[PDB]
Amino acid sequence: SGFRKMAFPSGKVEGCMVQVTCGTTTLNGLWLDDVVYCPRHVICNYEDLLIRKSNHNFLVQAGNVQLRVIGHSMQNCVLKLKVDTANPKTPKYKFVRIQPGQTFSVLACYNGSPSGVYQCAMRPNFTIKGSFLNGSCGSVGFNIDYDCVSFCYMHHMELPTGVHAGTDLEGNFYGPFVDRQTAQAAGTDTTITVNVLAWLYAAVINGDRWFLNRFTTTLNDFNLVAMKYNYEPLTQDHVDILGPLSAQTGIAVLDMCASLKELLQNGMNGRTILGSALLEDEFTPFDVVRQCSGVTF
Amino acid sequence: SGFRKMAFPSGKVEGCMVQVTCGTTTLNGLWLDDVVYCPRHVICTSEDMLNPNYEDLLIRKSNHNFLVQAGNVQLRVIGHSMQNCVLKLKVDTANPKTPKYKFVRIQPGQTFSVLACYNGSPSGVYQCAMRPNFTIKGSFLNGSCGSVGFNIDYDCVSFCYMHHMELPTGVHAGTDLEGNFYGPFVDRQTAQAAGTDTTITVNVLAWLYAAVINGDRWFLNRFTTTLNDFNLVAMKYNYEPLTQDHVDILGPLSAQTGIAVLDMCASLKELLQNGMNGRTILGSALLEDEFTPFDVVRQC
Ligand SMILES: *[C@H](O)[C@H](CC(C)C)NC(=O)[C@H](CC(C)C)NC(=O)[C@H](CC(C)C)NC(=O)OCc1ccccc1
Ligand SMILES: [Cl-]
Ligand code: NA
Ligand code: NA
């Protein structure tokens, strides 16, 4: 038993992290096969500014070994450096783009050296609530599936409120952000309803049951409450995804929605759920299944 | 900026995990050089898990009764010995992925990363703390025994915990890597319970300093307190006593923020009397006690 914010084992990703230096800027790159991927602002009109640069301007260090750059190109907001050596530690991988509400692990790195791992959710306003200091640009987000690494995030900047924004590995930003020193702010965020419900199921599976009640609701009635408290809408697809947790616990989703409705309207009356005094929304339904059934990689 | 329960990257530990089977019992082992370390209850026969005589059981085993698998490879056991509650299997091949490592026994309040594993394979990584009652609040299912806890400050892996059991409140107990249990527990299924747990006061203070470093001030006050008056209050909320060692340890965060340690203690006193009134600190509506003063400096 027990329930913790759990990240994927990071070893497959650790073997791909390198240090990239251009002039006096140093940040992290992802070495896969014979290409190194990193944020394009390492060269700081990127188009005009990339043509001036040449191959030996980019210093790539894998541990204590230098890679030689034999080509470079830009794709959206990511820089791609072709190197003369394929990474022998390249795992099975693919590039994916995730949706708001989905979770992933972040490997936070400095000077090409991994330093910590934590689990995050892509917020509805397309930020992540991470922990990043100077030099973390190029740190990466990922999920693991059977034996495949899905890379989904690369860090580019911190916003004034202290949250973080980045791109997918194809260089497209998540959210309404740009990579340059202009005034930018995180939009109003909302709570990921389907994830809160999944975490309430986790609580039940772990014996924390006090918030359960005899009542049920309708998707319509509950969504009018959700809107009222800045909760994301709950769709029929969301209901269906929670189906395995409903069957395992005996609590139908709209029965659990009645519990969540009361928690919103009335609060926690001084109690906690799974050691938290707030409603947690960074576990997906799949995260709860995986942790409570012991999936391995 | 930002403050997150960060775990250490787990790759150096992943390369050491193996599966160990004896009879019908399978659990995880830790393969370092030519030794596999695992919990000694892998030898326990299904019948007597209440009062097993582990010394008697082990002498009756042959090397070939122990099946050790690394990935798709079977390792040959060529000897065995027991050290306290840990079984040490000598194998005929040194692990080529062995990192720089040491074994350390930690004190209550210290934090570490757990790599939870099943059948020799990693499932996930998370941060834990050794509670004052010598349990940890982990996430462990059947087959997780032999998963380890570790820190990786500056490229050397310090192994501090190996998982053995779950107690009735749903908390977890285990040993150091020399096989000595943390706390009064034994690796038998006789009735056992953890003591009343308490809050790790020095870690709460470290986290309030982290909050101040991240721009939060709303809980500060103009008061100061004596160490003695603070401990008399803390007691009544089941908080651990604060010692002069803890005060010394908070010195650097006190310097970085300009807030004296006993000034911050008076803030904590007030929080214990009022609650948070629907406010949060570093994204939490509870006082967090599983970040050490060291963790705060590492991250800030
Ligand atoms: C090893 O993978 C496994 C991990 C658990 C998290 C499931 N550990 C055990 O099975 C362990 C073996 C014994 C010989 C150390 N047993 C326990 O952890 C056991 C709980 C199991 C049966 C779920 N705990 C236990 O026996 O605690 C003592 C006790 C007995 C009776 C009443 C209260 C406490
Ligand atoms: Cl310690
Ligand atoms: Na209900
Ligand atoms: Na004060």
Three-class SS string for A133-148?
CCCCCCCEEEEEECCE
Closest-CA distance of chain B to residue A108, Å: 9
Which residues of B are part of the catalytic machinery?
Answer: 41, 145
| Residue B44 Cα: closest atom of ligand 1 | 14
- Whether residues B232 and B263 share a domain: the answer is yes
Residue A216: count of CB within 10 angstroms of its CB: 15
- Whether residues A171 and A241 share a domain: the answer is no
Q: How far apart are CA A141 and CA B294, in angstroms?
A: 26
- Domain final residue, candidates B99, B129, B150: B99
Burial class (CB in 10 A: 0-12, 13-18, 19+), B222: exposed
Ligand 2 centroid to residue B117 C-alpha, Å = 24
Q: How far apart are CA A172 and CA A40, in angstroms?
A: 12
One-letter amino acid for residue A243 of the chain: G
Residue B50's Cβ-side half-sphere holds a number of Cα atoms within 13 Å equal to 3
Element of type H or E holding A274: none
Q: Are B209 and B253 in contact (CB under 8 A)?
A: yes
Structure tokens at B230: 């603070």
- Whether residues A5 and A99 share a domain: the answer is yes
A41 is catalytic: yes
Structure tokens at A102: 């989905």
Beta strands at B148-151 and B111-118: parallel, antiparallel or unpaired: antiparallel
- For residue A55, give the DSSP letter: G
Check which CATH number belongs to the domain holding B176 and give it. 2.40.10.10
Domain limits at A120?
1-14+92-189
3-class SS of residue A42: helix
- Whether residues B86 and B32 share a domain: the answer is yes
Maximum distance among all Cα pairs of chain A, rounded to whole angstroms = 69
Nearest of A81, A64, A70, A62 to residue A22 by alpha carbon: A81
Check which CATH number belongs to the domain holding B216 and give it. 1.10.1840.10
- Whether residues A205 and A277 share a domain: the answer is yes
Element of type H or E holding B201: helix B201-213
Q: For chain A, which residues lie within 8 Å of any Cβ of chain B, measuring from their own Cβ?
A: 1-12, 14-15, 107-108, 114-118, 129-133, 158, 162-164, 206-207, 272, 275-278, 290-297
Chain A nearest-CA residue for B153: A115
Give the rounded distance of the alpha carbon of B145 from its chain centre.
Answer: 14
| Mutation choice for B interface testing from A105, A161, A199, A296 by most B CBs within 10 A | A296
- For residue A263, give the DSSP letter: H
Q: How far apart are CA A170 and CA A30, in angstroms?
A: 12
Q: How far apart are CA A112 and CA A59, in angstroms?
A: 12
- Whether residues B122 and B6 share a domain: the answer is yes
- Whether residues B190 and B259 share a domain: the answer is no
B27 lines ligand 1 (CB under 6 A): yes
Q: Long-range contact list for A252-255, CB < 8 A, 24+ apart?
A: A252/A216, A253/A197, A254/A216, A254/A217, A254/A218, A254/A219, A254/A222, A255/A215, A255/A216
Ligand nearest to the CA of B268: 4
| Mutation choice for B interface testing from A10, A103, A139 by most B CBs within 10 A | A10
Q: Residue B4 — φ and ψ, nearest 5°? A: -135, 140
Cβ contacts (< 8 Å) between B10 and chain A: which residues?
9-11, 117
- For residue B273, give the DSSP letter: H
Name the region of A235 (left: φ>0; alpha: ψ -120 to 50; beta: rest). Answer: beta
Element of type H or E holding B153: none
Q: How far apart are CA B145 and CA B127, in angstroms?
A: 17
Helical H runs in chain A?
Answer: 11-14, 46-52, 193-205, 219-228, 236-241, 243-249, 253-266, 285-293
Q: Where are the beta strands (DSSP E) in chain B?
A: 17-22, 25-32, 35-39, 66-70, 73-75, 77-83, 86-91, 101-103, 111-118, 121-129, 148-151, 157-166, 172-175
Q: How far apart are CA B45 and CA B42, in angstroms?
A: 8
Query: Using DSSP, how many helices (H) and how many strands (E) does chain B show?
Result: 8, 13
Rg (CA), chain B: 22
**Cβ–Cβ of A131/B286 closer than 8 Å?**
no
Q: How far apart are CA A274 and CA A202, in angstroms?
A: 8
Q: How far apart are CA B189 and CA B175, in angstroms?
A: 16
- Domain final residue, candidates A144, A161, A189: A189
Q: Are B158 and B151 in contact (CB under 8 A)?
A: yes
Q: Which of B10, B139, B142 shows the shortest C-beta gap to A9?
A: B10
Q: How far apart are CA B223 and CA B14, in angstroms?
A: 49
Closest-CA distance of chain A to residue B215, Å: 10
Residue B230's Cβ-side half-sphere holds a number of Cα atoms within 13 Å equal to 24
Q: How far apart are CA B242 and CA A180, in angstroms?
A: 47
What is the residue whose two structure tokens read 């059948």?
A: B119
Residue B232: count of CB within 10 angstroms of its CB: 12
Domain count across chain B: 3
Q: How far apart are CA A173 and CA B63, in angstroms?
A: 57
Q: Are B115 and B148 in contact (CB under 8 A)?
A: yes
B142 lines ligand 1 (CB under 6 A): yes
Burial class (CB in 10 A: 0-12, 13-18, 19+), B276: middle
- Whether residues B264 and B120 share a domain: the answer is no
Element of type H or E holding A106: strand A103-110
Cβ contacts (< 8 Å) between B285 and chain A: which residues?
276-278
**Cβ–Cβ of A10/B9 closer than 8 Å?**
yes
3-class SS of residue A58: strand
Q: How far apart are CA A246 and CA A253, in angstroms?
A: 6
From residue B111, alpha-carbon distances to A103, B32, B105, B281, B291 in Å are: 24, 23, 12, 20, 7
Residue B162's Cβ-side half-sphere holds a number of Cα atoms within 13 Å equal to 28
- For residue B64, give the DSSP letter: G
Q: In what order do the strands lie in the sheet containing A65-67?
A: A65-67, A58-62, A17-22, A25-32, A35-39, A78-83, A69-75
- Domain final residue, candidates B148, B174, B197: B197
- Whether residues A147 and A5 share a domain: the answer is yes
One-letter amino acid for residue A79 of the chain: L
- Whether residues A173 and A120 share a domain: the answer is yes
Q: Residue B159 — φ and ψ, nearest 5°? A: -85, 125
- Whether residues A135 and A103 share a domain: the answer is yes
**Cβ–Cβ of A158/B1 closer than 8 Å?**
yes
- Whether residues A10 and A157 share a domain: the answer is yes
Q: How far apart are CA B190 and CA B168, in angstroms?
A: 12
Element of type H or E holding B269: helix B261-274
